[PDB]
């Protein structure tokens, strides 16, 4: 298979900036490469073909370059629409291969996360399960570490994490870490703490409750 490697894998940039994405093929592909754009959620749009040619409808600010095994996509003066995912693809040899993609994220100022920890509801405990939820909302940048400690001891298993895409209003990211236990193990411990690690604070953000509180 022809190994097309892209870099960077993502990038925080502002409206009006010029960005360059590159794809390197594990061999000479003779300008047989196309660049694709995948928007939120969505579907795909072909940007350029045969290394340098734009497709019908593609705004002039898109440009491709490259020879042999090195190709590049350039987006002069980014616009709001331009913030998406870009992929390169080699079509010179079966099986047509794609690059790992590059995500264009809109940069904004740092923002600390709002942390919230929730005890398992009575309704759930009746069943015999006990999920402890922690929300880390509206933070920046995306890099955040979340530790779940039970009575002062870190817990790895049962931790289910989930992130949202970059919100279109504030441009922040939110995280949800849920710690699923059984009612048996839940009732054998008292301290449950959701601990976050972010550069916006020199000391970890710590939210906790006690199984004995209301």
């Amino acid at each position: 298979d022809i190994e097309l490697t892209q870099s960077p894998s993502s990038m925080s940039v502002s409206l009006g900036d010029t960005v360059s994405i590159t794809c390197h093929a594990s061999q000479g592909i003779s300008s047989n490469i196309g660049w694709l754009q995948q928007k939120p959620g969505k579907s795909f749009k072909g940007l350029i073909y045969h290394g340098t040619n734009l497709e019908d409808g593609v705004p002039s600010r898109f440009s491709g370059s490259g020879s042999g095994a090195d190709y590049s996509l350039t987006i002069s003066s980014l616009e709001s629409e331009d913030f998406a995912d870009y992929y390169c693809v080699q079509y010179v040899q079966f099986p047509f291969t794609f690059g790992s993609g590059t995500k264009l994220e809109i940069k904004r100022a740092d923002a600390a996360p709002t942390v919230s920890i929730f005890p398992p509801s009575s309704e759930q405990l009746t069943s015999g399960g006990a999920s402890v939820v922690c929300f880390l909302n509206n933070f920046y940048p995306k890099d955040i570490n979340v530790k779940w400690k039970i009575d002062g001891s870190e817990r790895q298993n049962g931790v289910l994490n989930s992130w949202t895409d970059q919100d279109s209003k504030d441009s922040t990211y939110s995280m949800s870490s849920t710690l699923t236990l059984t009612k048996d193990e839940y009732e054998r411990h008292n301290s449950y703490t959701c601990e976050a690690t972010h550069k916006t604070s020199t000391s970890p953000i710590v939210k906790s409750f006690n199984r004995n509180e209301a």
Binding site: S43, D56, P95, P120, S121, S131, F135, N161, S162, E213
Partner: protein, 220 residues
């Protein structure tokens, strides 16, 4: 105008076959160019499966050659995909897409919207909805309430906060697998004066099971 639209059931049982249809309008699949099938795995990874040319010839990816089958119906102008003996790894979003077309000035490629096809053996199993009220600490001028939807299958689920009048400060996180059943949560941040005097009801709906659960977030 050329348009490609995919069709076919979105749920397949392991060991059986996945079959999709791509209806082409605005051009004849016998005239020119290759009509492809590609999939995007959860993780954004893309894989090219194969194609059927205008002459009836097919080219499949080597690693799929024994399980894949690309076929057409010229009179109805649609081509299909059939993946045999699917396993959970085949869970992906499928796209039918064309090679480079030349109708306008510069070439252009056409894509479909893509359909997600999940491979599991789980019966549709409705969600368990739990209200996440604050636990008895600070608070401040803003409250964050939650709604836990767990152990449901298949995807998706619709979560709204009333009935839909509550739009701001709402975060519905994507679903993750947990022993073959899905689990998601949503949070809403309202000023501390509103709740609980101004009720916050979480509305969870699961289409696949004709279920509509309304769980009010009341203070502990």
């Amino acid at each position: 105008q050329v348009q490609l639209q995919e069709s076919g059931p979105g749920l397949v049982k392991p060991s059986q076959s996945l079959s999709l249809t791509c209806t082409v309008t605005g051009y004849s699949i016998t005239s020119d160019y290759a009509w492809n099938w590609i999939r995007q795995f959860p993780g954004n990874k893309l894989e090219w499966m194969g194609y059927i040319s205008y002459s009836g010839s097919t080219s499949y990816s080597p690693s799929l050659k024994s399980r894949i089958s690309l076929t057409r119906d010229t009179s109805k102008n649609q081509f299909f995909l059939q993946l045999n003996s699917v396993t959970t790894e085949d869970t992906a979003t499928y796209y039918c897409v064309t090679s480079l077309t030349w109708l306008l000035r510069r070439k252009r490629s056409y894509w479909g919207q893509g359909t997600t096809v999940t491979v599991s053996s789980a019966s549709t199993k409705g969600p368990s909805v739990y209200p996440l009220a604050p636990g008895s600490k600070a608070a401040a001028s803003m409250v964050t309430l939650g709604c836990l939807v767990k152990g449901y299958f298949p995807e998706p689920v619709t979560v709204t906060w009333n009935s839909g009048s509550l739009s701001s400060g709402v975060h519905t996180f994507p679903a993750v697998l947990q022993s073959d059943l899905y689990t998601l949560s949503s949070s809403v941040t309202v000023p501390s004066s509103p709740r609980p005097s101004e009720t916050v009801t979480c509305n969870v709906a699961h289409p696949a099971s004709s279920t509509k659960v309304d769980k009010k977030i009341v203070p502990e």
